[PDB]
Amino acid sequence: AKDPSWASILQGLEEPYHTFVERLNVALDNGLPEGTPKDPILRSLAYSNANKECQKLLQARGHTNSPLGDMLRACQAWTPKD
Amino acid sequence: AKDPSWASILQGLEEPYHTFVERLNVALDNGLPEGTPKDPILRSLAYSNANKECQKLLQARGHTNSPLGDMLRACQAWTPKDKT
């Protein structure tokens, strides 16, 4: 039983963080079973499967009423090398 | 949009990593809807909800066909500052 496709979505080393989060959001929207809450799974995977540089930025992210927004904001100044 | 309880399971600053992962495993067994694959979500939370010291150890973990085992092994020698 291979893992679902949404479990192997990894941020590219040159991929903008917001693009990765958008891809992951759609994969979970489409692939998580009915009645499974997407939001907390998205937030966890958007950290654990982010690239190494963005994981460091995410560890120091904010603590607001918009927890997904806090993750995007923490990486908003990050620039891929290429 | 109150998150489920399994999503607020956080490794204490003084909590052994294996005990934290077990608490995640139980919370998902009882909280995650029956039929949603637990293992990828357990592995994800075992990083995202881990304490900073164990997150650093996890950064150097291996890359095998046993990804949860890689996480457990990476933190298997970490001991909290207060053992009580």
Residue numbers in the entry:
A (entry chain B): 128 to 209
B (entry chain A): 128 to 211
The authors write:
Human T-cell Leukaemia Virus type 1 (HTLV-1) is an untreatable retrovirus that causes lethal malignancies and degenerative inflammatory conditions. However, our structures reveal that HTLV-1 does still have a pocket formed between helices 3, 4, and 5, albeit an electropositive one capable of binding to either phosphate or sulfate in vitro.
To obtain higher resolution, we expressed residues A128-L214 (CACTD), which were purified as a dimer and crystallised in space group P212121 with diffraction to 1.47 Å resolution. To improve the CA full-length structure, we re-solved it by molecular replacement searching for three independent copies of the refined CACTD structure as a search model. Curiously, while this residue is well-resolved in the electron density map from the CACTD structure, it makes an aromatic stacking interaction with its counterpart in the dimer partner that necessitates a breaking of the two-fold symmetry. Y113F was chosen in order to remove only the hydroxyl group of the side chain, which binds to a water molecule, bridging this residue to the sulfate/phosphate groups. Lastly, while we were confident in our assignment of the biologically-relevant CACTD dimer interface, we decided to test mutants at both this interface (Y174A), and the alternative interface suggested by the interdigitation observed in the CACTD crystal packing (R188A, and H190A – see Supplementary Fig. 3g).
